[PDB]
Amino acid sequence: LNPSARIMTFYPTMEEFRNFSRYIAYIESQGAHRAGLAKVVPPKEWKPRASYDDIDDLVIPAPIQQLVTGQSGLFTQYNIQKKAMTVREFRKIANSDKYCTPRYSEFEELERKYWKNLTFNPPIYGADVNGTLYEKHVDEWNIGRLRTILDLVEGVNTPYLYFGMWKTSFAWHTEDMDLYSINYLHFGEPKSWYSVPPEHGKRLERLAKGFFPGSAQSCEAFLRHKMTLISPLMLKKYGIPFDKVTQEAGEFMITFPYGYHAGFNHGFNCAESTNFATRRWIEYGKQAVLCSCRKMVKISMDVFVRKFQPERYKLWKAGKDNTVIDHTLPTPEAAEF
Ligand SMILES: [Cl-]
Ligand SMILES: [Zn+2]
Ligand SMILES: [Zn+2]
């Protein structure tokens, strides 16, 4: 199942789509998790909100100006927190001559423009806005209430909004605690993604440590700072396997445990995201290498070990748990498929 570890796209029917956790387990039986990223195109009839015409006065409390430094495909992104602005103000700046998307034929052209110009004219990313664009009655794939085993913890169970503009980027990273994530592009211009299969994640980390040794000495898990940008050409040069995909409005992206991802926004858009878990994640949770230098998201794995692994509970607390994760294996919940 998926030996190539290539990004898979799924087109569930309304019946298949209704049960989120079951569908995550189905895509895993198909080997989608091997890529570390999957796309899910929901049924045509499904909409999480009737219209996005009432969000002009929605406040983005901490928009960030993204300053990128670097050359030859290696970059460091610095965030400058700007004062609170409304979606109306943000959209005006996003669509202005200074910050709008350049003209292009194919995506390859826009991708070249992104890697050529990411250090110039720093954009503003309306990122990490606490909130949802989902209407209350929406029961299918509601990011605000997915009801996975992650709910056992209960502030990383909560939804976040991302208002993008051309050239805004998310640096190479896996999720906090090496969790899964769900990303829905509500509206606007596309969002392009790069992924490194979980089975090759250590190779990406080794490459990154070699390039930023100062950062590697200060923090073992320095990629969790979400400041490191590495071009696909650099990954190709050093033999890091990866894949790319463009997410369009109305599509979901799923990131899997220990799936490194990066990317950028084509223009003015809005995405919603949260983290979630499956029984498979638990092991990734106990083995996750965390950021040491920052006082960072940490989940106590005790609750999850005493419920789903009670046989290994005593051995793990003693430090005798020598379990080696096989990234190719699907979640136990995929057994029905
Ligand atoms: Cl809008
Ligand atoms: Zn992410
Ligand atoms: Zn750190």
The domain locations on the chain are: 7-337
Which candidate, 205, 191, 181, places its Cα nearest to that of 281? 181
Of the CA atoms within 13 Å of residue 241, those in its CB half-sphere come to 15
Q: CB-based contacts of 158: which residues, under 8 Å, 6+ apart?
A: 130, 144, 274
**Residues contacting residue 301 through CB under 8 Å, at least 6 positions apart:** 282, 285, 286
Rounded to whole angstroms, the Cα distance separating 297 from 175 reads 10
- The residue annotated as part of the active site, out of 162, 180, 184, 284, is 162
Reference 101, options 226, 265, 304; nearest CA is: 265
In sequence order, the 6+-apart residues with CB closer than 8 A to the CB of 95 are 267, 268
Let me know if 209 is exposed, middle or buried by CB neighbors in 10 A (0-12, 13-18, 19+).
middle
Distance 265 CA to ligand 2 centre (A): 14
The residue type found at 232 is: P
219 is in an annotated binding site: yes
CA–CA gap between residue 150 and residue 158 (Å, rounded): 11
Q: What is the resolution of this structure in A?
A: 2.4
**Does residue 154 have an active-site annotation?**
no
Asked whether 171 and 263 are in contact (CB, 8 A), the reply is: no
Phi, psi of 16 (to 5 degrees): -60, -45
Task: Report which bound ligand comes closest to the CA of 183.
Answer: 2
Q: Does 109 participate in catalysis according to the annotation? A: no
Give the tokens for residue 62. 């901490």
Phi and psi at residue 128, to the nearest 5°: 50, 45
SS3 per residue for the chain:
CCCCCCCEEECCCHHHHCCHHHHHHHHHHCCHHHCCEEEECCCCCCCCCCCCCCCCCCEECCCEEEEEEEECCEEEEEEEECCCEEHHHHHHHHCCCCCCCCCCCCHHHHHHHHHHHCCCCCCEEEEEEECCCCCCCCCCCCHHHCCCHHHHCCCCCCCEEEEECCCCEEEEECCHHHCEEEEEEEEECCEEEEEECHHHHHHHHHHHHHHCHHHHHHCCCHHHHCCEEECHHHHHHCCCCCEEEEECCCCEEEECCCCEEEEEECCCEEEEEEEECCCCHHHHHHHCCCCCCCCCCCCCCHHHHHHHCCCCHHHHHCCCCCCCCCCCCCCHHHHHC
- Catalytic residue at 11? no
Tell whether 226 is in a known binding site: yes
Phi, psi values for residue 263, rounded to 5°: 165, -170
Residue among 26, 111, 173, 263 flagged as catalytic: 173
b/e string for 75-84 if b means 16 or more Cβ within 10 A? Answer: bebebeeeee
| Cβ–Cβ < 8 Å for 158, 278 | no
- The bridge status of strand 37-40 relative to strand 8-10 is parallel
Task: List b or e across 253-280, with b for residues whose CB sees 16 or more CB atoms inside 10 angstroms.
Answer: bbbbbbbbbbbbbbbbbbbbbbbbbbbb
CA of 270 to the centre of ligand 1 (A): 8
Q: Is residue 186 annotated as a catalytic residue, yes or no?
A: no
Is residue 175 part of the annotated active site? The answer reads yes
Experimental method: X-ray
Tokens 């943000």 label which residue?
90
Q: How far is the CA of 176 from the centre of ligand 3 (A)?
A: 12
Alpha-carbon gap, residue 187 to 99, rounded angstroms: 18
User: Chain-centre distance of CA 107, in angstroms?
Assistant: 21
- CA atoms of 329 and 327, how far apart (whole Å): 6
For the beta carbon of residue 163, count every other beta carbon within 10 angstroms.
26
291 marked as binding residue: yes
State the ligand closest to the CA atom of 270. Answer: 1
Paired with 181 in beta bridges are 255, 275
Beta-carbon count within 10 A of 202 CB:
11
Q: Check 155, 214, 239, 319 and give the catalytic one.
A: 155
Residue 241 burial (10 A CB sphere; 0-12, 13-18, 19+): middle
Based on the residue annotation, tell me whether 195 is a catalytic residue of this protein.
Answer: no
Instruction: Give distance in angstroms: CA of 219 to centre of ligand 3.
Output: 4
Residue 119, Cβ neighbours under 10 Å: how many?
16
Rounded-to-integer distance, Cα 265 and Cα 170, Å: 9
Radius of gyration of the chain (CA): 20
**Residue 63, number of CB atoms within 10 A of its CB:** 24
**Angstrom distances, CA of residue 301 to CA of 149, 305, 309:** 12, 6, 11
Residue 116, phi-psi category: left (phi > 0), alpha (psi -120 to 50), beta (remainder): alpha
Contacts of 299 (CB under 8 A, 6+ apart): 153, 156, 176, 177, 285
Residue 225 alpha carbon to ligand 3 centre in Å: 6
Q: How far apart are CA 195 and CA 37, in angstroms?
A: 6
Give me the amino acid identity at 218: S
What length is written for the chain?
Answer: 337
Beta strands 252-255 and 85-86, pairing class: unpaired
CATH of 7-337, one of 2.60.120.650, 1.25.40.10, 3.30.70.3150, 3.40.50.2300: 2.60.120.650
Does the annotation place 125 within a ligand binding site? yes
d(CA 140, CA 266): 27
